[PDB]
Amino acid sequence: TSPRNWCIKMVCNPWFECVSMLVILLNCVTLGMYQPCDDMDCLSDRCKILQVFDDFIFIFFAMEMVLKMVALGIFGKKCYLGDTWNRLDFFIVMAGMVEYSLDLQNINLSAIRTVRVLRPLKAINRVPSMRILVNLLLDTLPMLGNVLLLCFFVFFIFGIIGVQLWAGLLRNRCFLEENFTIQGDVALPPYYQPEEDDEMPFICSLSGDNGIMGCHEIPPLKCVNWNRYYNVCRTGSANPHKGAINFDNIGYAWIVIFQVITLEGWVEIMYYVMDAHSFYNFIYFILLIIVGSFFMINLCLVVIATQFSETKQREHRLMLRETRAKLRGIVDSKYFNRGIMMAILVNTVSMGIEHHEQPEELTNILEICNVVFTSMFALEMILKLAAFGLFDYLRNPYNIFDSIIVIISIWEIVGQADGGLSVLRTFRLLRVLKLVRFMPALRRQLVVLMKTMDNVATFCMLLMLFIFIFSILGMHIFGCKFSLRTDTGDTVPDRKNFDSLLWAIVTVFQILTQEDWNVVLYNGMASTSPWASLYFVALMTFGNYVLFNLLVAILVEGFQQTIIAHKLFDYVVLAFIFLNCITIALERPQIEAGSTERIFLTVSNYIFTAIFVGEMTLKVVSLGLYFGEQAYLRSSWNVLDGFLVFVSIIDIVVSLASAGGAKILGVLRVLRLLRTLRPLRVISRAPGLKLVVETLISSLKPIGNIVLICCAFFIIFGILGVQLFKGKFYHCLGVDTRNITNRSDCMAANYRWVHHKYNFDNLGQALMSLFVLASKDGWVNIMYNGLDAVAVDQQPVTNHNPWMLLYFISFLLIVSFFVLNMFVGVVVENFHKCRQHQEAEEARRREEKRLRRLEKKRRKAQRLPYYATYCHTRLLIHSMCTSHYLDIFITFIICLNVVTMSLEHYNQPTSLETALKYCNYMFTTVFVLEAVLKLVAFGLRRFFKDRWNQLDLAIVLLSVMGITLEEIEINAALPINPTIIRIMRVLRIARVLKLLKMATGMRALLDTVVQALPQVGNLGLLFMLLFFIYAALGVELFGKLVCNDENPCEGMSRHATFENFGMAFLTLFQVSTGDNWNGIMKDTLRDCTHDERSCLSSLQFVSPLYFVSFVLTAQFVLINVVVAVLMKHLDDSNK
Ligand SMILES: CC(C)CCC[C@@H](C)[C@H]1CC[C@H]2[C@@H]3CC=C4C[C@@H](OC(=O)CCC(=O)O)CC[C@]4(C)[C@H]3CC[C@]12C
Ligand SMILES: CC(C)CCC[C@@H](C)[C@H]1CC[C@H]2[C@@H]3CC=C4C[C@@H](OC(=O)CCC(=O)O)CC[C@]4(C)[C@H]3CC[C@]12C
Ligand SMILES: CC(C)CCC[C@@H](C)[C@H]1CC[C@H]2[C@@H]3CC=C4C[C@@H](OC(=O)CCC(=O)O)CC[C@]4(C)[C@H]3CC[C@]12C
Ligand SMILES: CCCCCCCCOc1ccccc1C(=O)Nc1ccc(C(=O)OCC[N+](C)(CC)CC)cc1
Ligand SMILES: *[C@@H]1O[C@H](CO)[C@@H](O)[C@H](O)[C@H]1NC(C)=O
Ligand SMILES: *[C@@H]1O[C@H](CO)[C@@H](O)[C@H](O)[C@H]1NC(C)=O
Ligand SMILES: [Ca+2]
Ligand SMILES: [Ca+2]
Incomplete structure (x- = not known):
């Protein structure tokens, strides 16, 4: 219409999108300046100005919303509520309007204020690359529900097991004796805790519950040993980690299971449970690790990669001066280049020698050598432009790079005043990158990586937006609530806090690396409320298990003499090597000299070596050492066999040479290490392992270039870390460690001068620390030491140099990128092998696949005995009572069972327990009724043929067995020990398995695993x-x-x-x-x-x-x- 007409032109004007993006970015800036720790009710000039721009932004957002409203219409596919994102804009507009109106009514309620965070989420609409990426992500999400349901099964099963076993067991500490008589000066805590305020609790084991540590293991205190008085322990207190790790509810059990899914703090709670309840809960934790942390999150990766590939195909399917000549010969020789390559490589080696407490003379030789080197590169500079000319020189940009290097070097030389010696020293490392001009395959590898990074950029922006929104959310809800309680006169803020945007982003990045994220979870969830764990669950799930699987998918689909007796000999020797493994598994450094077992190990070693020598001799007389082709030593495994037997026999003779063992104990150590290497012939004596090792080594070569590039960045960043941190990784650990600046005051106070184990003194230490960083484990401590660094011999200070976050985070990002490239290279490498063999036999399978279709043609009707129960009182059962009409009731009752088992907790009220008993009775009745009706519906044939009604009968049988035993607990007919009752209660979880029949997608996915x-x-x-x-x-x-x-x-x-x-x-x-x-x-x-x-x-x-x-x-x-x-x-x- 005309009113639409005067406005529709601007709406589709790209400058409208430009100004919209400008106001979105301005709004993101205004959101980034929030300071919850300081911005108390906007009593500041900065707060006022930020609120003014916030009002202006809201005015513009309302205007653009209503204008696109009067230009598109409402409630239609072409209308304004046509895009998913326009509905989102609607939602932010309404929410902000409600927030403003409630501000008008003197109801602040900064819980509608936190809806600001969704405002940056509108920028996804205004970057079309982000629209496309997010659109594919959202269109592939709905097929992630199958693995989400598997996730639900493995959380619910383990959560029920945990709440049934360890409900409230985590609370018990070793208390004082009930009637404790003391002369005075009441100072003891009611129970025993080693470190102040339950930093590490001392979870006991109740009498009757066969735990491990049971209050008589308390380390005696060293006045009088007070800890011997903590006699009895009872289950009443707060439970560990400020009430964060427990199995009381099922929400808390879900929290703990999610913690061990991310493989963080696993062992500490494993020992909590071992102490409280039993030693054999390691079975529970090992199965949980294997099933969840390996076969869940990796099934998430597999499903996301496959589904993203399928979505890519689907949307794609819709579309479908005479010396100048002479001087050149030396240059383009292919040999002078090798000489200058050795020059650059020894320059790199020279840069690597430097370390801490470096000798006066060695560093002097280093500067002399640097001058010689840079003279060589400057000579090359002068030469290669003379014989070539300026334009021929500038034709190759590698020449530009070399010119920059030589000018920086010469500037550094003459800048012996200041500035140059400190920073141009750091630019020395760029000479290492010159090697790319020489390796031809590494050019191709980096070109491939740039081909990938063409598409990573939009994903980096999406990840940056995700981290920004979640960091702003954390700022809003966790602002200034992390303040650690006072220990030195004041409450110092926690390092992993949310007090400002920089720390919010670094902490969200840390959580995304899932390193020490449990510390932040505890410290924040014990501060606001136990429901605050949903923030971390949402962040970790959507980041690690959705966004990063998306990135992996992006990469994978951007790339895409005497007689011979050899009948049972290998199996007999295989049994013998198995016995060798068994006797290897006992050589612990605890058996005393002259032991009965020691003699057994010596004699077994003798006999095993004799047997293996016999095996080698038979193999060699069959073949010959190297006497011609197809000899003994022409296979790698046989070389390993001979190597192992030589090692064993030399070890035997040296051990028999034990008389006078001085200076040969090192030889003994080496030969014993090789004995430990010995149980390795199983690879040669087994087909599956041999083929699998062949496949591993075959799949290792193609990622060789990427591994080499990663090692090159390891060396470069190691030298950089050496430059940045030389002796700065020292700290004066003591009782105070305060008001002291340098180690001189440390020795004055006599505390200690402690040296961190992961430092950058040498280059080997730098490499070890960089590997620790790359493993995303313990990297937060290394980063903290980096930021704290000041100089060689004075105390580091908290967040001295916040600029090293760039080094420590860029390293993590680059190494993670290279690791993903290795993963994708392995995947595509295997893809080539599988695709080759696939086409032949699948086409061969398709010849037989259609034969099975012809088999179904035979299946039409073999006169099924459906009449045999007809008019036999089963006229309504076989047909009217076997369709889908009855299974919906059954799955509903299963869901009611699930939601009832999800109610037990510690100190559940007795009324709830009785109600649950009634519900369990009802469930037993319905299961028995269903089973009997089925048995009467069809003959005993399919009762076994189905392979499923067998499981149904098993569940019903266990349930009816259980309900009678609890009935035995009514009259106390016979004293039944609690173990069996608890076991059958915890086996009641098996009634969840009935959901498997309806979940065809679960069956398909688990089969594809199978x-x-x-x-x-x-x-x-x-x-x-x-x-x-x-x-x-x-x-x-x-x-x-x-x-x-x-x-x-x-x-x-x-x-x-x-x-x-x-x-x-x-x-x-x-x-x-x-x-x-x-x-x-x-x-x-x-x-x-x-x-x-x-x-x-x-x-x-x-x-x-x-x-x-x-x-x-x-x-x-x-x-x-x-x-x-x-x-x-x-x-x-x-x-
Ligand atoms: C899509 C969902 C699953 C994840 C996205 C994160 C947020 C939408 C949810 C998940 C965590 C929830 C938070 C969990 C815990 C808290 C602390 C809680 O703190 C208080 O009760 C303080 C008292 C008060 O403010 O009145 C307030 C609700 C809140 C902010 C929740 C707000 C909404 C959050 C941030
Ligand atoms: C089938 C093969 C390939 C794997 C199975 C071998 C190991 C898993 C088993 C066999 C030998 C067992 C070990 C035999 C000897 C020891 C020392 C033993 O120590 C003691 O007897 C002292 C304990 C005490 O003093 O209370 C504890 C069990 C342990 C670790 C056993 C742990 C489990 C081992 C290594
Ligand atoms: C002289 C005395 C007092 C101290 C002995 C020096 C060691 C502490 C240093 C010197 C050489 C260093 C080694 C130099 C090379 C490396 C390879 C490095 O392997 C890597 O992780 C890099 C390869 C990669 O991950 O890509 C492991 C650490 C290590 C063994 C270093 C371990 C620590 C070493 C032995
Ligand atoms: C210079 C351009 C930069 C481009 C950004 C690249 C993103 C960098 O990746 C991060 C960026 C920021 C924060 C964290 C990460 C990270 O690595 N998360 C994280 C992923 C996987 C897990 C995990 O266990 O699954 C195992 C998966 N593999 C393959 C085993 C199957 C081992 C990885 C845990 C943690
Ligand atoms: C440390 O130095 C401060 C600075 O004045 C001083 O007040 C304090 O007494 C010193 N000692 C300790 C233990 O803090
Ligand atoms: C060490 O710190 C003290 C305390 O300020 C200072 O006086 C001294 O100059 C520093 N350097 C030393 C002792 O070498
Ligand atoms: Ca970890
Ligand atoms: Ca850790």
């Missing part, structure tokens, strides 16, 4: 073998590291120490999860107070190698497991 079990099973076997090797090796290396008060451990707390084989297998499992593994490796590399030679041994060289190798190998195996599942998923999708 036909991956060949590959997944062999990989799991190899993964367990990897644990076996590394566990034996860790027992031999680390078994003597004592863990006690004199040696304060950090990662090996109670059962994680490397003493025995199993107690080390547990800590290898924990390191595999990356939970405080950096703490474990800090524990291993530890100089002791001369109670052992190991602390003075070569541990510093070998423990980082041990842990780095283990973590990398474990992560690689898990990556390939996930890849195999993804491949079965895609292949199933194609058919």
